[PDB]
């Protein structure tokens, strides 16, 4: 997030980090319950990857994080790779997350929910803070 700030450690409990077996953080994600993760379908997640939960500082070693294994990648069939439309995939965890003070689910809206333009919202992540 270019021009963002550092977050309060543990303040966004649903935020996860998708890392390949090399340890490289390539995408983010959101926990919707102890067994399901939501991320972008374009992330190209495979079952060989890992979901990291309860992480704040990717460079710390004393963090009691949760390295979670992916059972199945559920790419939304409407997903259009040429347009990047309907960019969503569900990740079914083989090993369910352990909810705590730093690990929990974000709520999902009604198909009918309204989010008016002008509403200030929040986005999080470990993306580049500078290009």
């Amino acid at each position: 997030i270019v021009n963002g700030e550092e977050a309060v450690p543990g303040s966004w409990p649903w935020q996860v980090s998708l890392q390949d077996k090399t340890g490289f953080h390539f995408c983010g994600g959101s926990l919707i319950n102890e067994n399901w993760v939501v991320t972008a379908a374009h992330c190209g997640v495979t079952t060989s990857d890992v979901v990291v939960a309860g992480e704040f500082d990717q460079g710390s070693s004393s963090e009691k994080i949760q390295k979670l294994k992916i059972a199945k990648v559920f790419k939304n069939s409407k997903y259009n790779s040429l347009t990047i439309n309907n960019d969503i995939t569900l990740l079914k965890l083989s090993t369910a997350a352990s909810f705590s003070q730093t690990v929990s689910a974000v709520c999902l809206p009604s198909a009918s929910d309204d989010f008016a333009a002008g509403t200030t919202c929040v986005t999080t992540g470990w993306g580049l803070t500078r290009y």
């Binding site: 649903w14 390539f26 919202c121 470990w126 580049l128």
Partner: peptide, 13 residues
């Protein structure tokens, strides 16, 4: 502000 490479799959709440 702006989301950037590595933020994908992340949440907007």
């Amino acid at each position: 502000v702006s989301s950037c490479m590595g933020d994908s799959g992340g949440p907007l709440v």
